[PDB]
Amino acid sequence: GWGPYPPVERDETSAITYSSKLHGSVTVRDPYSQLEVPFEDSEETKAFVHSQRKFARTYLDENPDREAWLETLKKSWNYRRFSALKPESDGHYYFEYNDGLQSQLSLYRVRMGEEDTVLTESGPGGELFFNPNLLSLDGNAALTGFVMSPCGNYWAYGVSEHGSDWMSIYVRKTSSPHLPSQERGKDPGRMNDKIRHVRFFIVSWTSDSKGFFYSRYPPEDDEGKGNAPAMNCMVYYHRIGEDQESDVLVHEDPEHPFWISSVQLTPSGRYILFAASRDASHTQLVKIADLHENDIGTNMKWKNLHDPWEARFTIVGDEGSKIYFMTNLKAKNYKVATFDANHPDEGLTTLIAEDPNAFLVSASIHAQDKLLLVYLRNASHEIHIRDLTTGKPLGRIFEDLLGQFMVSGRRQDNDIFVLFSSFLSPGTVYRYTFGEEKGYRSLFRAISIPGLNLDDFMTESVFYPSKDGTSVHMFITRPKDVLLDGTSPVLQYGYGGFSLAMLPTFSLSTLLFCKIYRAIYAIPNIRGGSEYGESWHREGMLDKKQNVFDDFNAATEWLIANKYASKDRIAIRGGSNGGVLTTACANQAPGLYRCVITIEGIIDMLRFPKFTFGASWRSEYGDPEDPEDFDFIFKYSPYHNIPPPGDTVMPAMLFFTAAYDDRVSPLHTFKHVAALQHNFPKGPNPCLMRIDLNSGHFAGKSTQEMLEETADEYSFIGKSMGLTMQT
Ligand SMILES: *C(=O)[C@@H]1CCCN1C(=O)[C@@H]1CCCN1C(=O)OCc1ccccc1
């Protein structure tokens, strides 16, 4: 007797006709099309959001395990967190720090040579440089990025107010840190520079430290609460001390408003790379200019790097006229190649060949002539050292560590700081010093979590057959003392797309779920990701997207068949592209799943191109307005494939979405929740929408909101699957 669902107005006439290769045309009905109108523009959308919000709150709050979860999460989340040390041109190391339950990581610094005094029981040490929590009253304003002037006197930084893809760029002196005395709701100590209407932090200082390049868009009233396509990306140069109105236009392309464009300077500041993107594929239109020839503006001598739309190019470094690129040019797994700007017609020369069995994730220069490569092989990271001059192998480092690495250190430094993490390791900072034949490794600092004994857990590697017989890898994290007797709950997380690998990643909350509910945490490395190189992505996109859903369903069947999980206690979870996975799998195999968690899900696979950044995803999903693509998209589009109610028991489903979410428009969740509640008015399992009116994502917003969302998710799974919380 948790019902009834709040009513939702239907438009029974609303339909769009799509061209179809098989059927000539298909008229598709959308009775909830009015919920495409943003919250702030429609009283109907407002009434839907408020009624669904209130309904979900009432259901979630009637479970006593919700408060129990909130308390469990507050205790366990209260641990000291930090990044590796990042060396900067002002002669300081910078590091992120959280004392425990602050919304945003704070930026601390220490004089190079004094770093052995930081991150102790006494506290972070060094000096507090920047506290993003001070920027807002709610802790929802976040640092989107930062870059120091080459001179080391200035610091350019991005702030997004409500966690949307809108930010302003500020500048402050490196002599002007945030003082501890200062209170919330202000950014004291900044210079007057304010760069508005930015949607991504790609910022390059000129070597004269007089100004920086940036990308911006036309102004927008509904600041991240609109859902119009993101259009008319422009490159500008800002001179320090000038109003944004004086900024010089570097590039615009009015013919192609859907293109995204940015510039990047080589570390020397001599060469500028222009890159335009027309979709989510790893392909660019690229141009190089030599800043020793040009004054900044629309009068720069742009040179051809390579034919457009064949490859992506990222700067690794430069040596005079030679530029080092990480590129996928005739190499889908990426490689390192050099360009001589003095011989453009010779094109690119291979320095490090493509590895046919490993995705090259990053390439960086250290100790003058050591090339550090991070490879993704078999769904985890490997570090290889190469000679910059010859490309000759100089050996592996951190081979004994299975997980992922974040590498800090510049070409002029003999040292790197490497943050290692996995499903079981929250964060170990190693220091590595390059030598002639071998280096020196030391453990600098390790994150400890008082609230949880990590030795109680194990991560295994299994391989399971998908529907088509493809062998898929899965990671299984679990408590060592849990019996595989077919009674355990599972939390099964998937994404499957955009060459994004699900690599070993530390999540405290997930391990608390495993301990408290005696549960298994399953990460199937399904197609669409880069776990087995770029071909793994190709086998899970466009007309092969169904492979992703089949891989995920087969993972669940395997866990049940091999007694890892109860048939009655499978919870699946996914976000963004992961939401196509959760909603498709719920439609295609509702009987496998007891609980489905969808975070900012993409669900309407016909209408996705019409909103914010959606048109770029046509490279991944296909173009719904193309007759050939329409047929394979329409087969799985979860919004259009909700099972007929008479012979399906739909799982319990909880949808998270945000008001400022301009990445995936909330309308996806709005319409699907409306449709599910309409199809299954009597459940028996509830379909709920949990909305945050004050963020545009679910990480790097207020700790209060994050705790409540997690307490809602875990308490909802507990209720839906009939679980008891263990001490
Ligand atoms: C989440 O998975 C959504 C839905 C499908 C793909 N996607 C993304 O967020 C993709 C994947 C990586 C980044 N991305 C994206 O949309 O970036 C475009 C962009 C957004 C904001 C500024 C600049 C570019």
Author numbering: 5 to 731
From the manuscript:
OphP tolerates sequence promiscuity in the substrate but has a preference for highly α-N-methylated substrates and for N-methylated glycine residue at the catalytic site. The promiscuity of OphP is explained by structural analysis of co-complexes which reveals a predominantly hydrophobic substrate binding cleft with few interactions between substrate side chains and OphP. Similar to other POPs, the monomer has two domains, an α/β hydrolase domain (residues 1–82, 453–738) and the seven-bladed β-propeller domain (residues 83–452) ([Fig fig4]).
We determined the covalent complex structure of OphP with ZPP by soaking wild-type OphP crystals with 5 mM ZPP overnight. Additional electron density, which we fitted as ZPP covalently linked to S580 (**Figure S11**) was seen in two subunits. The other two subunits had weak electron density suggesting low occupancy. The overall structure of the OphP:ZPP complex is largely unchanged from the apo structure of S580A (0.5 Å over 716 Cα atoms) (**Figure 4-Figure supplement 2**). There are differences in loops Leu139–Ala146, Ser164–Met171, Ser179– Met195, Pro222–Gly230, Leu696–Ser706 and Ala622–Tyr664. The carbonyl at P1 proline of the ZPP(acyl)-enzyme intermediate hydrogen bonds to the backbone amide of Asn581 and the side chain hydroxyl of Tyr499. The benzene ring of ZPP is located in an aromatic hydrophobic pocket. These results confirm Ser580 as the key catalytic residue and suggest a structural re-arrangement of active site residues including His701 upon substrate binding. The OphP:ZPP complex has a proline group at the P1 site which results in Ile606 adopting an unfavorable conformation ([Fig fig5]).
